[PDB]
Structure 1
Amino acid sequence: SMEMDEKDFAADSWSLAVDSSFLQQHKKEVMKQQDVIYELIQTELHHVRTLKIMTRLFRTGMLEELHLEPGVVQGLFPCVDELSDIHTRFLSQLLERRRQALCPGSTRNFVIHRLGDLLISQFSGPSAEQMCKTYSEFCSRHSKALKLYKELYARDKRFQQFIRKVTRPAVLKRHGVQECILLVTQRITKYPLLISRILQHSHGIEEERQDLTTALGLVKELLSNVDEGIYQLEKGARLQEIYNR
């Protein structure tokens, strides 16, 4: 992540991020809604950061330092460039909505009143079809990626040294290769939980309650489609094992 965004999302909540004199101008219901919207953006910033660790630290580091056989790096990090493009774009839209809402003279005081429309756009049309295609492919390659990682770590000395080197810093404590893969697989199922809680505190404007209700339905439709499109790939699986599923 870049320092400007890390600092803007350093606080544990929106109520601790904004100036106390600005917080005191809002009703409790607005504070509750803004705290959950802040958690959605903060966790999206961290999810994009997980994808940058996968693409820049691991994938590109293995290509530039190691002599892995062709197709091995793609097997460890399936769809990571596509996943990075989807979420970096979505994060960009969330951060621009926050930036437009800032009070003049402030880099921290804002209220986002219209998140629903942004979520409907993200979870409908071509962007939703791309999210569905990409997660159906990524989640079906999840087990294979973990097994390939374990095999390389146990048998390749230079691979083991590389992993131990780049994951040594304390800031990588939660972000080993297998941890990154599961953080990405679990991201999509966090959205309904966050959206439902934002919706609970968005009844003040009927058009906003309706828009978040539509967005929640679109997110659940995407999850149902991804879940129905998953079948774990396995290296060395024979055709007979597949057609006898």
Structure 2
Amino acid sequence: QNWQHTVGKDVVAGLTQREIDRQEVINELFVTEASHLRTLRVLDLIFYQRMKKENLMPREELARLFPNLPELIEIHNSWCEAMKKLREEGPIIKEISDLMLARFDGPAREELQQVAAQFCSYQSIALELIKTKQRKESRFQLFMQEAESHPQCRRLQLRDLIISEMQRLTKYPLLLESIIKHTEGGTSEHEKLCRARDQCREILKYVNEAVKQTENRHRLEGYQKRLDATALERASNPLAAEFKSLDLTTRKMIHEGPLTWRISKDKTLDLHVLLLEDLLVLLQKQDEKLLLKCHSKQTFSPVLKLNAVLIRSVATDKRAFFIICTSKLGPPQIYELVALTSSDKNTWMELLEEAVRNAT
């Protein structure tokens, strides 16, 4: 159970309380790495290999679910074996900072974040497909019930085993932190773990980021199917006329959400706005449609180019902010947009200013 309960009371005989508590945390790292590698091998053997052999879906669809499982397994296997190689020279594990850098620093860091990114990016979309595939096919629902009842899964479903990589990458930083808690402060060891810890959070951010980006690409795809830009073919507003056949897919989404638009005195319109790299598109909803319209008071353009806007705070309203369209060829305009809370106003403002700067 404990590190203390293993090894021996003979072997802890001559050790400080700090050193023991330190061994207890290091052990936890080693043991849970062994569990995570095995969880990955369960994915490989019970799901990936059986699906491959039995042709349950097309190859490209299967590669999307497990893009690089063998390579991911190789990462945690090589690390796990280096841990085991360390345990060979006595149950009291000494300097451990060199082990941690070998996985979270330099090339290693590059290798790990690339693979983990690729493995987790699309995963939420793939899982949903799997859920829908089960309602569609009897033959696939039979396989999923067979595979999830396998002993090796130990009563776990696919969704629980596959999310384990994220869980693991989200745990690394807390696990290092406890080791650092119980290390002599101001030693070479201490600084190096800190360096290792810092990079874990970087990798965390990097992978969450790629998940965030892929999820966004997928949301845009969805939004493109529901886009009605029909009114933009009748033109009149020269700026709006540019976007008669918009296509969101060619751009990345930065942010999105509901804003109320103060078009006039005692005239409001609820929108759902998208912030993209180069554009701010204001979208109105009918039922399941996403409308692009002009909107009268001379008209407003539903799509604004970020390289021709100004961002300013409404001083009387900490919920509201101005976007001023400075596009030439047409009269300039004031969009007054209201956020849900003050904190939400600040979040929009912040992301807006950043995107305008990068556009300009």
- Could you say which residue in structure 2 is the equivalent of 1:49? 38
58 and 206 in structure 1: CA distance in 2 versus 1, 3 angstrom threshold:
same
- Could you say which residue in structure 2 is the equivalent of 1:243? 251
Larger Rg: 2
Equivalent pair of 2:149/2:155 in contact (CA under 8 Å): no
Equivalent pair of 2:148/2:155 in contact (CA under 8 Å): no
Where do 5+ consecutive residues of structure 2 fail to align?
A: 225-246, 254-360
Indicate the structure with greater strand content: 2
Question: 2: distance between equivalents of 1:215 and 1:133?
Answer: 17
Q: Show structure 1 runs of 4+ deviating over 6 A.
A: none
- Could you say which residue in structure 2 is the equivalent of 1:118? 99
64 and 199 in structure 1: CA distance in 2 versus 1, 3 angstrom threshold:
same
Question: 1: distance between equivalents of 2:180 and 2:74?
Answer: 27
- Could you say which residue in structure 2 is the equivalent of 1:20? 9
- How do residues 1-245 of structure 1 correspond to structure 2 at under 5 angstroms? 12-99=1-88, 101-102=89-90, 110-169=91-150, 172-173=153-154, 175-203=156-184, 206-230=187-211, 231-233=213-215, 234=218, 237=222, 240-241=248-249, 243=251, 245=253
TM-score (norm 2): 0.58
Where do 5+ consecutive residues of structure 1 fail to align?
A: 1-11, 103-109
Secondary structure at 1:22 match in 2: coil
Q: Which has the higher contact order (CA 8 A, sep 6+)?
A: 1
199 and 78 in structure 1: CA distance in 2 versus 1, 3 angstrom threshold:
same
Q: How big is the shift at 1:60?
A: 0.3
171 and 26 in structure 1: CA distance in 2 versus 1, 3 angstrom threshold:
farther
Deviates more, 1:56-65 or 1:166-175: 166-175
Question: 2: distance between equivalents of 1:69 and 1:55?
Answer: 17
Secondary structure at 1:190 match in 2: helix
How many residue pairs end up in the alignment?
Answer: 226
Indicate the structure with greater helix content: 1
- Could you say which residue in structure 1 is the equivalent of 2:294? none
- Could you say which residue in structure 1 is the equivalent of 2:281? none
Question: 1: distance between equivalents of 2:182 and 2:155?
Answer: 32
AA in 1 matched with 2:169: I
Equivalent pair of 1:139/1:185 in contact (CA under 8 Å): yes
TM-score (norm 1): 0.83
Identity across matched positions, percent: 28
